RNA sequence: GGCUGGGAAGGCCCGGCGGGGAAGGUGGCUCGGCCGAGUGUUACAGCCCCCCCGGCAGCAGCACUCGCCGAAUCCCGGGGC
RNA sequence: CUGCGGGAUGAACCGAACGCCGGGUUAAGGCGCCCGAUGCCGACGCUCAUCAGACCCCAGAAAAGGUGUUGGUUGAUAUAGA
RNA sequence: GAGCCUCGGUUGGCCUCGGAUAGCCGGUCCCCCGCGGGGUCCGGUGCGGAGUGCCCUUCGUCCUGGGAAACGGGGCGCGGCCGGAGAGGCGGCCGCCCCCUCGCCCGUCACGCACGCCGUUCGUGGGGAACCUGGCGCUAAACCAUUCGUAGACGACCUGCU
């Protein structure tokens, strides 16, 4: 009935000053701002949800216009609660500074 | 995860519901029961990776779970091949899944023992009837369950 | 879902960096009372720096030259734009998300505003050092509407004082009611304080 | 030479025996260095500077860390320094207040770097001596010699500024 | 206007560090920003500690500035610092914060229900008080 | 496992020895209610600190985490990609 | 005849040399924003500049001075009263 | 009621001024000033529990059958009295009709129990464009053409014409 996922901001790709690697995204999870509270989110599934013009299939329901890109959180990123994520398809860079859902059911609790 | 503990189911249609863990089947799936009167979750199978184990346990040692129900009992059998397969026929119809009254009697037998124990603890029935969700200012890494 | 910040008491660059970083991440930020922002260093030094900025102008056609905005809100907007990549679409979107106001308008005068301790003068600056008010700098560099903003802010302060008096009276009434009614809610405050509340 | 949390090392060494000199004398030094390798290197440097002895022509009989005898006691350490500035070298005498000799030496190194921009390779330490309440010439360490010490913490500048960054309440600096 | 002074024998609460959340008595002042401190009754060893990590409370037990780890303990036991600290409102709200941190899901649900009922009752009483005050003013 | 066969510390202390900060003392003065607080002068120890004689399990790099080198003087379990 | 990471920019500088990729770790360099990372409850001190300062090559300053301030060396006199 | 495109999202906080070698809250026996404000005194906290380390609302439904609490809410409920001008755009205070017994604890069952599998859950009756129901109101102005010179390279500009 409510939200069963955490909010994350797509900060950007894994990049240096003049080179970027689009296969590894950076996720800023709300509520964690240190590399001690990020142990819970390691290995968690993540989804980028976006709606498009043409209708697509939808499990357990009628076809909808919404689509998602799935991914997995690999490890934390530099003492500030940032985490690294790897998606099956690289993020389109349109989602820079946009919301993604960190699911809670690779549970290890 | 211990028998008699309370779990939160996160992936199924019973999203965020709270259930009672009874036993682990041969296949490794957890047998889950959220009282039909309270949680509307019958004898079902869940997965450990898709379950949150809360820190709430009831004394479940004094119950007799039926032996016959098992992983083979919790299985699907429909969608047979040899029929016509051409047109607007061949298993797109029948629109339903039967309730299998043996399932009803098993649920009654399990609930007759589950309900008195969970009603001994105050507010436990209400807690089970409530569902889990995330609100503003609450973080899973912060709060402990 | 939108940050509201009080510019009073905050350092210019210290607050601008945080605001720019937040607005890069899709967060909508509104800053009010930009005249209350204070910059480190003496006022004469800051005024000379801004006069040099004014002297920076296009020789052949100043109309195309740098746009030296005098209002404190626009000064803060420009200093955030200097930290944002305004040449790109993401930077332009961040600038559009950011909003700056002189004083505090009625759309935000009745909203609680956050304070950033990482950019406060008392936190980041030694008490023996000098600082210059952005309102004073703007007024002495070309701003026109300092007195009007001051009068409107005083009227808003009076109205907010009345509102705070009403809210404090309400809180006192709530305390009296709780004291009078605790006998029939003893079993609720007890379970509240067993878990770490009201203590 | 770099520096960290320095430790004191007693190093005894002697030149290798020769047919003319069967029993050479042994020399002992106190070297403050981060580890035993740099301690032995500094010992060889000082021995080469002082006597006619080289690392290839000698051997370190024993290098061992020296522990503070009274770690829990507060002491005044006077250190004699001979450093190299941009101009010619100078001699200095400094006083510090600390619990350990190694800590006092580290504090002296940090103070020298902060005040004179003197590097550890240019700094040479001659002697560190523990002294009583008297025989102290520096007012900075003399002011703490008071039985009824009493002073508050006036301007308590708060930390955890990046703990939740946006808050309604402004911080407090009086406690 | 200062009420707390760094005096020999004053108790202080360790805000952060290895011995975080413990009481410890200042024995001697080492430097401008370092003090010798001892925690015999609070499982803290005699050691140097900066003033930043320690927040001084309003308890001052008297013992010599260089006590040998025993007279400070005797003074602590005689003054019974632990009981007075537990009675102070500071430790009470510290314990309340710890309990809220340790709150579980079932406890959270019970707290939510209790808060709902208590807030409804308090709001009804406040509304009745407001209408009574308005009638009195009229 | 090694060390200065680790340094100090924790507890019971016992029979002595000298020195120092300057204290339930004395004392010029100051401030409040014989008492409490702040300053100074000789200065024993009934506040203590340090050294020399001599001994008890309470240790152990100690979860009173005060400051090392480590591994046939070393093994187990778990999580993430 | 030479790409690559850093020096904002770049022949010769630092690191390091090249088949197409996935994971991990570094060097030289950095961690307020642009821009990946100190969003450490970092440690010790110095510094007020109405021309402050901010990192090899490198893109800028000298002699002489200042009770501005922070340390060091030496020399006298002061209860027989400076 | 379908009907194309565009998307962000996944409860809200409706608010004092302010200082940092200081502040927050009451009563104010007392005094001054226009229920309110200021001053003295007194009493409670101040690593802030009148804490954004926070508060507010619960996020299953329906049947009856008890207790504690209890006259609250709704029908984009219908009509009056106001606050609000900074870039007001929202809220408050009173009358009349009908309906409901909702919060907190316990029994009492029933809700496709869709047999483990993902974009669930909402701010949304979202914003823009084209079409089907009614009631109350509307009636054009601009440009070209002509003319004029206070204007003019051409445009443009100042003017006249039931």
mmCIF file with all atom_site columns, N, CA, C and O (backbone and C1' of nucleotides) in Angstrom, chain C residues 8 33 101-102 104 106 110 112 157 163-165 168 172 175 184, chain H residues 14-20 25-27 36-37 49-50 69 86-87:
data_model
loop_
_atom_site.group_PDB
_atom_site.id
_atom_site.type_symbol
_atom_site.label_atom_id
_atom_site.label_alt_id
_atom_site.label_comp_id
_atom_site.label_asym_id
_atom_site.label_entity_id
_atom_site.label_seq_id
_atom_site.pdbx_PDB_ins_code
_atom_site.Cartn_x
_atom_site.Cartn_y
_atom_site.Cartn_z
_atom_site.occupancy
_atom_site.B_iso_or_equiv
_atom_site.pdbx_formal_charge
_atom_site.auth_seq_id
_atom_site.auth_comp_id
_atom_site.auth_asym_id
_atom_site.auth_atom_id
_atom_site.pdbx_PDB_model_num
ATOM 1   N N     . UNK C 1 8   ? 20.300  34.856 5.396  1.00 0.00 ? 8   UNK C N     1
ATOM 2   C CA    . UNK C 1 8   ? 20.888  35.628 6.482  1.00 0.00 ? 8   UNK C CA    1
ATOM 3   C C     . UNK C 1 8   ? 21.858  34.775 7.291  1.00 0.00 ? 8   UNK C C     1
ATOM 4   O O     . UNK C 1 8   ? 21.555  33.633 7.644  1.00 0.00 ? 8   UNK C O     1
ATOM 5   N N     . UNK C 1 33  ? 16.087  36.236 1.587  1.00 0.00 ? 33  UNK C N     1
ATOM 6   C CA    . UNK C 1 33  ? 16.880  37.227 2.314  1.00 0.00 ? 33  UNK C CA    1
ATOM 7   C C     . UNK C 1 33  ? 18.353  37.148 1.915  1.00 0.00 ? 33  UNK C C     1
ATOM 8   O O     . UNK C 1 33  ? 19.244  36.921 2.736  1.00 0.00 ? 33  UNK C O     1
ATOM 9   N N     . UNK C 1 101 ? 15.475  35.245 -4.256 1.00 0.00 ? 101 UNK C N     1
ATOM 10  C CA    . UNK C 1 101 ? 14.582  36.368 -4.013 1.00 0.00 ? 101 UNK C CA    1
ATOM 11  C C     . UNK C 1 101 ? 15.261  37.387 -3.112 1.00 0.00 ? 101 UNK C C     1
ATOM 12  O O     . UNK C 1 101 ? 15.990  37.023 -2.186 1.00 0.00 ? 101 UNK C O     1
ATOM 13  N N     . UNK C 1 102 ? 15.021  38.666 -3.393 1.00 0.00 ? 102 UNK C N     1
ATOM 14  C CA    . UNK C 1 102 ? 15.449  39.736 -2.502 1.00 0.00 ? 102 UNK C CA    1
ATOM 15  C C     . UNK C 1 102 ? 14.464  39.826 -1.345 1.00 0.00 ? 102 UNK C C     1
ATOM 16  O O     . UNK C 1 102 ? 13.251  39.922 -1.562 1.00 0.00 ? 102 UNK C O     1
ATOM 17  N N     . UNK C 1 104 ? 12.146  38.272 1.305  1.00 0.00 ? 104 UNK C N     1
ATOM 18  C CA    . UNK C 1 104 ? 11.420  37.004 1.334  1.00 0.00 ? 104 UNK C CA    1
ATOM 19  C C     . UNK C 1 104 ? 9.975   37.243 0.906  1.00 0.00 ? 104 UNK C C     1
ATOM 20  O O     . UNK C 1 104 ? 9.217   37.920 1.615  1.00 0.00 ? 104 UNK C O     1
ATOM 21  N N     . UNK C 1 106 ? 5.883   36.816 -0.264 1.00 0.00 ? 106 UNK C N     1
ATOM 22  C CA    . UNK C 1 106 ? 4.721   36.163 0.363  1.00 0.00 ? 106 UNK C CA    1
ATOM 23  C C     . UNK C 1 106 ? 4.565   34.702 -0.036 1.00 0.00 ? 106 UNK C C     1
ATOM 24  O O     . UNK C 1 106 ? 4.041   33.910 0.761  1.00 0.00 ? 106 UNK C O     1
ATOM 25  N N     . UNK C 1 110 ? 5.499   32.541 4.549  1.00 0.00 ? 110 UNK C N     1
ATOM 26  C CA    . UNK C 1 110 ? 4.765   31.690 5.476  1.00 0.00 ? 110 UNK C CA    1
ATOM 27  C C     . UNK C 1 110 ? 5.209   30.234 5.360  1.00 0.00 ? 110 UNK C C     1
ATOM 28  O O     . UNK C 1 110 ? 4.396   29.311 5.415  1.00 0.00 ? 110 UNK C O     1
ATOM 29  N N     . UNK C 1 112 ? 8.474   27.569 6.777  1.00 0.00 ? 112 UNK C N     1
ATOM 30  C CA    . UNK C 1 112 ? 9.673   27.389 7.585  1.00 0.00 ? 112 UNK C CA    1
ATOM 31  C C     . UNK C 1 112 ? 10.876  27.168 6.679  1.00 0.00 ? 112 UNK C C     1
ATOM 32  O O     . UNK C 1 112 ? 10.808  26.403 5.713  1.00 0.00 ? 112 UNK C O     1
ATOM 33  N N     . UNK C 1 157 ? 8.056   40.999 9.716  1.00 0.00 ? 157 UNK C N     1
ATOM 34  C CA    . UNK C 1 157 ? 8.515   40.635 11.052 1.00 0.00 ? 157 UNK C CA    1
ATOM 35  C C     . UNK C 1 157 ? 7.436   40.891 12.091 1.00 0.00 ? 157 UNK C C     1
ATOM 36  O O     . UNK C 1 157 ? 7.248   40.088 13.008 1.00 0.00 ? 157 UNK C O     1
ATOM 37  N N     . UNK C 1 163 ? 1.981   36.100 14.752 1.00 0.00 ? 163 UNK C N     1
ATOM 38  C CA    . UNK C 1 163 ? 1.725   34.677 14.543 1.00 0.00 ? 163 UNK C CA    1
ATOM 39  C C     . UNK C 1 163 ? 2.433   33.824 15.588 1.00 0.00 ? 163 UNK C C     1
ATOM 40  O O     . UNK C 1 163 ? 1.871   32.836 16.075 1.00 0.00 ? 163 UNK C O     1
ATOM 41  N N     . UNK C 1 164 ? 3.673   34.176 15.931 1.00 0.00 ? 164 UNK C N     1
ATOM 42  C CA    . UNK C 1 164 ? 4.403   33.414 16.934 1.00 0.00 ? 164 UNK C CA    1
ATOM 43  C C     . UNK C 1 164 ? 3.774   33.567 18.310 1.00 0.00 ? 164 UNK C C     1
ATOM 44  O O     . UNK C 1 164 ? 3.766   32.618 19.098 1.00 0.00 ? 164 UNK C O     1
ATOM 45  N N     . UNK C 1 165 ? 3.257   34.756 18.625 1.00 0.00 ? 165 UNK C N     1
ATOM 46  C CA    . UNK C 1 165 ? 2.531   34.917 19.880 1.00 0.00 ? 165 UNK C CA    1
ATOM 47  C C     . UNK C 1 165 ? 1.318   34.000 19.923 1.00 0.00 ? 165 UNK C C     1
ATOM 48  O O     . UNK C 1 165 ? 1.065   33.333 20.936 1.00 0.00 ? 165 UNK C O     1
ATOM 49  N N     . UNK C 1 168 ? 2.532   30.382 20.364 1.00 0.00 ? 168 UNK C N     1
ATOM 50  C CA    . UNK C 1 168 ? 3.009   30.143 21.721 1.00 0.00 ? 168 UNK C CA    1
ATOM 51  C C     . UNK C 1 168 ? 1.848   30.037 22.701 1.00 0.00 ? 168 UNK C C     1
ATOM 52  O O     . UNK C 1 168 ? 1.875   29.209 23.619 1.00 0.00 ? 168 UNK C O     1
ATOM 53  N N     . UNK C 1 172 ? 0.978   26.796 24.983 1.00 0.00 ? 172 UNK C N     1
ATOM 54  C CA    . UNK C 1 172 ? 0.699   26.870 26.414 1.00 0.00 ? 172 UNK C CA    1
ATOM 55  C C     . UNK C 1 172 ? -0.643  26.230 26.749 1.00 0.00 ? 172 UNK C C     1
ATOM 56  O O     . UNK C 1 172 ? -0.768  25.509 27.749 1.00 0.00 ? 172 UNK C O     1
ATOM 57  N N     . UNK C 1 175 ? -0.152  22.510 26.640 1.00 0.00 ? 175 UNK C N     1
ATOM 58  C CA    . UNK C 1 175 ? 0.504   22.030 27.853 1.00 0.00 ? 175 UNK C CA    1
ATOM 59  C C     . UNK C 1 175 ? -0.476  21.956 29.017 1.00 0.00 ? 175 UNK C C     1
ATOM 60  O O     . UNK C 1 175 ? -0.480  20.977 29.775 1.00 0.00 ? 175 UNK C O     1
ATOM 61  N N     . UNK C 1 184 ? -6.203  10.196 32.254 1.00 0.00 ? 184 UNK C N     1
ATOM 62  C CA    . UNK C 1 184 ? -6.845  9.241  31.362 1.00 0.00 ? 184 UNK C CA    1
ATOM 63  C C     . UNK C 1 184 ? -5.986  8.869  30.160 1.00 0.00 ? 184 UNK C C     1
ATOM 64  O O     . UNK C 1 184 ? -6.445  8.112  29.300 1.00 0.00 ? 184 UNK C O     1
ATOM 65  P P     . C   H 2 14  ? 5.781   25.004 6.088  1.00 0.00 ? 14  C   H P     1
ATOM 66  O "O5'" . C   H 2 14  ? 4.901   26.329 6.144  1.00 0.00 ? 14  C   H "O5'" 1
ATOM 67  C "C5'" . C   H 2 14  ? 3.483   26.265 6.031  1.00 0.00 ? 14  C   H "C5'" 1
ATOM 68  C "C4'" . C   H 2 14  ? 2.799   27.052 7.123  1.00 0.00 ? 14  C   H "C4'" 1
ATOM 69  C "C3'" . C   H 2 14  ? 2.685   26.344 8.471  1.00 0.00 ? 14  C   H "C3'" 1
ATOM 70  O "O3'" . C   H 2 14  ? 2.765   27.313 9.516  1.00 0.00 ? 14  C   H "O3'" 1
ATOM 71  C "C1'" . C   H 2 14  ? 0.525   26.859 7.669  1.00 0.00 ? 14  C   H "C1'" 1
ATOM 72  P P     . C   H 2 15  ? 3.262   26.889 10.984 1.00 0.00 ? 15  C   H P     1
ATOM 73  O "O5'" . C   H 2 15  ? 4.475   27.877 11.282 1.00 0.00 ? 15  C   H "O5'" 1
ATOM 74  C "C5'" . C   H 2 15  ? 5.811   27.482 11.010 1.00 0.00 ? 15  C   H "C5'" 1
ATOM 75  C "C4'" . C   H 2 15  ? 6.566   28.545 10.253 1.00 0.00 ? 15  C   H "C4'" 1
ATOM 76  C "C3'" . C   H 2 15  ? 7.038   29.745 11.056 1.00 0.00 ? 15  C   H "C3'" 1
ATOM 77  O "O3'" . C   H 2 15  ? 8.202   29.480 11.817 1.00 0.00 ? 15  C   H "O3'" 1
ATOM 78  C "C1'" . C   H 2 15  ? 6.078   30.479 9.024  1.00 0.00 ? 15  C   H "C1'" 1
ATOM 79  P P     . U   H 2 16  ? 8.200   29.742 13.401 1.00 0.00 ? 16  U   H P     1
ATOM 80  O "O5'" . U   H 2 16  ? 8.277   31.327 13.528 1.00 0.00 ? 16  U   H "O5'" 1
ATOM 81  C "C5'" . U   H 2 16  ? 9.453   32.029 13.153 1.00 0.00 ? 16  U   H "C5'" 1
ATOM 82  C "C4'" . U   H 2 16  ? 9.305   33.514 13.364 1.00 0.00 ? 16  U   H "C4'" 1
ATOM 83  C "C3'" . U   H 2 16  ? 10.603  34.304 13.432 1.00 0.00 ? 16  U   H "C3'" 1
ATOM 84  O "O3'" . U   H 2 16  ? 11.105  34.626 12.147 1.00 0.00 ? 16  U   H "O3'" 1
ATOM 85  C "C1'" . U   H 2 16  ? 9.166   34.958 15.203 1.00 0.00 ? 16  U   H "C1'" 1
ATOM 86  P P     . C   H 2 17  ? 12.687  34.676 11.882 1.00 0.00 ? 17  C   H P     1
ATOM 87  O "O5'" . C   H 2 17  ? 13.164  35.990 12.644 1.00 0.00 ? 17  C   H "O5'" 1
ATOM 88  C "C5'" . C   H 2 17  ? 12.711  37.274 12.238 1.00 0.00 ? 17  C   H "C5'" 1
ATOM 89  C "C4'" . C   H 2 17  ? 13.096  38.336 13.237 1.00 0.00 ? 17  C   H "C4'" 1
ATOM 90  C "C3'" . C   H 2 17  ? 14.559  38.357 13.650 1.00 0.00 ? 17  C   H "C3'" 1
ATOM 91  O "O3'" . C   H 2 17  ? 15.387  39.027 12.717 1.00 0.00 ? 17  C   H "O3'" 1
ATOM 92  C "C1'" . C   H 2 17  ? 13.198  38.488 15.575 1.00 0.00 ? 17  C   H "C1'" 1
ATOM 93  P P     . G   H 2 18  ? 16.688  38.294 12.128 1.00 0.00 ? 18  G   H P     1
ATOM 94  O "O5'" . G   H 2 18  ? 17.602  38.036 13.407 1.00 0.00 ? 18  G   H "O5'" 1
ATOM 95  C "C5'" . G   H 2 18  ? 18.159  39.123 14.132 1.00 0.00 ? 18  G   H "C5'" 1
ATOM 96  C "C4'" . G   H 2 18  ? 18.298  38.803 15.599 1.00 0.00 ? 18  G   H "C4'" 1
ATOM 97  C "C3'" . G   H 2 18  ? 19.566  38.075 16.014 1.00 0.00 ? 18  G   H "C3'" 1
ATOM 98  O "O3'" . G   H 2 18  ? 20.676  38.944 16.156 1.00 0.00 ? 18  G   H "O3'" 1
ATOM 99  C "C1'" . G   H 2 18  ? 17.694  37.049 17.030 1.00 0.00 ? 18  G   H "C1'" 1
ATOM 100 P P     . G   H 2 19  ? 22.046  38.643 15.376 1.00 0.00 ? 19  G   H P     1
ATOM 101 O "O5'" . G   H 2 19  ? 23.086  38.303 16.534 1.00 0.00 ? 19  G   H "O5'" 1
ATOM 102 C "C5'" . G   H 2 19  ? 23.264  39.167 17.647 1.00 0.00 ? 19  G   H "C5'" 1
ATOM 103 C "C4'" . G   H 2 19  ? 23.665  38.390 18.874 1.00 0.00 ? 19  G   H "C4'" 1
ATOM 104 C "C3'" . G   H 2 19  ? 24.787  37.382 18.668 1.00 0.00 ? 19  G   H "C3'" 1
ATOM 105 O "O3'" . G   H 2 19  ? 26.060  37.983 18.824 1.00 0.00 ? 19  G   H "O3'" 1
ATOM 106 C "C1'" . G   H 2 19  ? 22.980  36.364 19.837 1.00 0.00 ? 19  G   H "C1'" 1
ATOM 107 P P     . A   H 2 20  ? 27.323  37.482 17.969 1.00 0.00 ? 20  A   H P     1
ATOM 108 O "O5'" . A   H 2 20  ? 27.986  36.356 18.881 1.00 0.00 ? 20  A   H "O5'" 1
ATOM 109 C "C5'" . A   H 2 20  ? 28.139  36.537 20.287 1.00 0.00 ? 20  A   H "C5'" 1
ATOM 110 C "C4'" . A   H 2 20  ? 28.003  35.230 21.030 1.00 0.00 ? 20  A   H "C4'" 1
ATOM 111 C "C3'" . A   H 2 20  ? 29.181  34.276 20.880 1.00 0.00 ? 20  A   H "C3'" 1
ATOM 112 O "O3'" . A   H 2 20  ? 29.268  33.458 22.044 1.00 0.00 ? 20  A   H "O3'" 1
ATOM 113 C "C1'" . A   H 2 20  ? 27.257  33.301 19.912 1.00 0.00 ? 20  A   H "C1'" 1
ATOM 114 P P     . C   H 2 25  ? 10.756  32.019 24.105 1.00 0.00 ? 25  C   H P     1
ATOM 115 O "O5'" . C   H 2 25  ? 10.108  31.202 25.309 1.00 0.00 ? 25  C   H "O5'" 1
ATOM 116 C "C5'" . C   H 2 25  ? 9.470   29.953 25.083 1.00 0.00 ? 25  C   H "C5'" 1
ATOM 117 C "C4'" . C   H 2 25  ? 8.968   29.341 26.366 1.00 0.00 ? 25  C   H "C4'" 1
ATOM 118 C "C3'" . C   H 2 25  ? 8.084   30.222 27.230 1.00 0.00 ? 25  C   H "C3'" 1
ATOM 119 O "O3'" . C   H 2 25  ? 6.745   30.275 26.772 1.00 0.00 ? 25  C   H "O3'" 1
ATOM 120 C "C1'" . C   H 2 25  ? 9.692   29.135 28.585 1.00 0.00 ? 25  C   H "C1'" 1
ATOM 121 P P     . G   H 2 26  ? 5.714   31.328 27.411 1.00 0.00 ? 26  G   H P     1
ATOM 122 O "O5'" . G   H 2 26  ? 5.075   30.545 28.643 1.00 0.00 ? 26  G   H "O5'" 1
ATOM 123 C "C5'" . G   H 2 26  ? 4.064   31.144 29.435 1.00 0.00 ? 26  G   H "C5'" 1
ATOM 124 C "C4'" . G   H 2 26  ? 4.229   30.800 30.892 1.00 0.00 ? 26  G   H "C4'" 1
ATOM 125 C "C3'" . G   H 2 26  ? 3.819   31.883 31.879 1.00 0.00 ? 26  G   H "C3'" 1
ATOM 126 O "O3'" . G   H 2 26  ? 2.427   31.854 32.146 1.00 0.00 ? 26  G   H "O3'" 1
ATOM 127 C "C1'" . G   H 2 26  ? 5.928   30.967 32.494 1.00 0.00 ? 26  G   H "C1'" 1
ATOM 128 P P     . G   H 2 27  ? 1.544   33.192 32.054 1.00 0.00 ? 27  G   H P     1
ATOM 129 O "O5'" . G   H 2 27  ? 1.324   33.616 33.574 1.00 0.00 ? 27  G   H "O5'" 1
ATOM 130 C "C5'" . G   H 2 27  ? 1.054   32.646 34.579 1.00 0.00 ? 27  G   H "C5'" 1
ATOM 131 C "C4'" . G   H 2 27  ? 1.856   32.925 35.826 1.00 0.00 ? 27  G   H "C4'" 1
ATOM 132 C "C3'" . G   H 2 27  ? 1.780   34.353 36.344 1.00 0.00 ? 27  G   H "C3'" 1
ATOM 133 O "O3'" . G   H 2 27  ? 0.643   34.599 37.155 1.00 0.00 ? 27  G   H "O3'" 1
ATOM 134 C "C1'" . G   H 2 27  ? 4.039   33.727 36.156 1.00 0.00 ? 27  G   H "C1'" 1
ATOM 135 P P     . G   H 2 36  ? -3.154  38.178 25.996 1.00 0.00 ? 36  G   H P     1
ATOM 136 O "O5'" . G   H 2 36  ? -2.246  39.241 25.232 1.00 0.00 ? 36  G   H "O5'" 1
ATOM 137 C "C5'" . G   H 2 36  ? -2.062  39.160 23.826 1.00 0.00 ? 36  G   H "C5'" 1
ATOM 138 C "C4'" . G   H 2 36  ? -1.487  40.436 23.264 1.00 0.00 ? 36  G   H "C4'" 1
ATOM 139 C "C3'" . G   H 2 36  ? -0.134  40.862 23.809 1.00 0.00 ? 36  G   H "C3'" 1
ATOM 140 O "O3'" . G   H 2 36  ? 0.948   40.163 23.222 1.00 0.00 ? 36  G   H "O3'" 1
ATOM 141 C "C1'" . G   H 2 36  ? -1.584  42.720 23.779 1.00 0.00 ? 36  G   H "C1'" 1
ATOM 142 P P     . G   H 2 37  ? 2.240   39.791 24.101 1.00 0.00 ? 37  G   H P     1
ATOM 143 O "O5'" . G   H 2 37  ? 3.123   41.116 24.062 1.00 0.00 ? 37  G   H "O5'" 1
ATOM 144 C "C5'" . G   H 2 37  ? 3.606   41.632 22.831 1.00 0.00 ? 37  G   H "C5'" 1
ATOM 145 C "C4'" . G   H 2 37  ? 4.209   43.001 23.007 1.00 0.00 ? 37  G   H "C4'" 1
ATOM 146 C "C3'" . G   H 2 37  ? 5.298   43.119 24.061 1.00 0.00 ? 37  G   H "C3'" 1
ATOM 147 O "O3'" . G   H 2 37  ? 6.565   42.684 23.598 1.00 0.00 ? 37  G   H "O3'" 1
ATOM 148 C "C1'" . G   H 2 37  ? 3.756   44.884 24.328 1.00 0.00 ? 37  G   H "C1'" 1
ATOM 149 P P     . G   H 2 49  ? 16.083  20.785 26.471 1.00 0.00 ? 49  G   H P     1
ATOM 150 O "O5'" . G   H 2 49  ? 14.647  20.373 25.916 1.00 0.00 ? 49  G   H "O5'" 1
ATOM 151 C "C5'" . G   H 2 49  ? 14.491  19.265 25.034 1.00 0.00 ? 49  G   H "C5'" 1
ATOM 152 C "C4'" . G   H 2 49  ? 13.056  18.806 24.964 1.00 0.00 ? 49  G   H "C4'" 1
ATOM 153 C "C3'" . G   H 2 49  ? 12.442  18.391 26.299 1.00 0.00 ? 49  G   H "C3'" 1
ATOM 154 O "O3'" . G   H 2 49  ? 11.044  18.679 26.281 1.00 0.00 ? 49  G   H "O3'" 1
ATOM 155 C "C1'" . G   H 2 49  ? 12.418  16.553 24.825 1.00 0.00 ? 49  G   H "C1'" 1
ATOM 156 P P     . A   H 2 50  ? 10.485  20.034 26.939 1.00 0.00 ? 50  A   H P     1
ATOM 157 O "O5'" . A   H 2 50  ? 10.083  20.932 25.686 1.00 0.00 ? 50  A   H "O5'" 1
ATOM 158 C "C5'" . A   H 2 50  ? 9.491   20.349 24.529 1.00 0.00 ? 50  A   H "C5'" 1
ATOM 159 C "C4'" . A   H 2 50  ? 9.096   21.391 23.508 1.00 0.00 ? 50  A   H "C4'" 1
ATOM 160 C "C3'" . A   H 2 50  ? 10.190  22.384 23.120 1.00 0.00 ? 50  A   H "C3'" 1
ATOM 161 O "O3'" . A   H 2 50  ? 10.038  22.736 21.744 1.00 0.00 ? 50  A   H "O3'" 1
ATOM 162 C "C1'" . A   H 2 50  ? 8.347   23.554 24.024 1.00 0.00 ? 50  A   H "C1'" 1
ATOM 163 P P     . A   H 2 69  ? -14.037 6.802  30.097 1.00 0.00 ? 69  A   H P     1
ATOM 164 O "O5'" . A   H 2 69  ? -13.619 7.426  28.692 1.00 0.00 ? 69  A   H "O5'" 1
ATOM 165 C "C5'" . A   H 2 69  ? -12.384 8.108  28.530 1.00 0.00 ? 69  A   H "C5'" 1
ATOM 166 C "C4'" . A   H 2 69  ? -12.178 8.535  27.098 1.00 0.00 ? 69  A   H "C4'" 1
ATOM 167 C "C3'" . A   H 2 69  ? -13.204 9.511  26.539 1.00 0.00 ? 69  A   H "C3'" 1
ATOM 168 O "O3'" . A   H 2 69  ? -12.908 10.858 26.869 1.00 0.00 ? 69  A   H "O3'" 1
ATOM 169 C "C1'" . A   H 2 69  ? -12.866 7.737  25.004 1.00 0.00 ? 69  A   H "C1'" 1
ATOM 170 P P     . G   H 2 86  ? 3.095   45.034 -0.286 1.00 0.00 ? 86  G   H P     1
ATOM 171 O "O5'" . G   H 2 86  ? 4.378   44.589 -1.116 1.00 0.00 ? 86  G   H "O5'" 1
ATOM 172 C "C5'" . G   H 2 86  ? 4.533   44.957 -2.482 1.00 0.00 ? 86  G   H "C5'" 1
ATOM 173 C "C4'" . G   H 2 86  ? 5.238   43.879 -3.268 1.00 0.00 ? 86  G   H "C4'" 1
ATOM 174 C "C3'" . G   H 2 86  ? 4.367   42.691 -3.661 1.00 0.00 ? 86  G   H "C3'" 1
ATOM 175 O "O3'" . G   H 2 86  ? 4.819   42.163 -4.909 1.00 0.00 ? 86  G   H "O3'" 1
ATOM 176 C "C1'" . G   H 2 86  ? 6.116   41.955 -2.244 1.00 0.00 ? 86  G   H "C1'" 1
ATOM 177 P P     . A   H 2 87  ? 4.404   42.881 -6.286 1.00 0.00 ? 87  A   H P     1
ATOM 178 O "O5'" . A   H 2 87  ? 3.594   41.765 -7.081 1.00 0.00 ? 87  A   H "O5'" 1
ATOM 179 C "C5'" . A   H 2 87  ? 4.237   40.961 -8.064 1.00 0.00 ? 87  A   H "C5'" 1
ATOM 180 C "C4'" . A   H 2 87  ? 3.917   39.500 -7.880 1.00 0.00 ? 87  A   H "C4'" 1
ATOM 181 C "C3'" . A   H 2 87  ? 3.335   39.143 -6.519 1.00 0.00 ? 87  A   H "C3'" 1
ATOM 182 O "O3'" . A   H 2 87  ? 2.417   38.059 -6.653 1.00 0.00 ? 87  A   H "O3'" 1
ATOM 183 C "C1'" . A   H 2 87  ? 5.416   38.037 -6.810 1.00 0.00 ? 87  A   H "C1'" 1
#
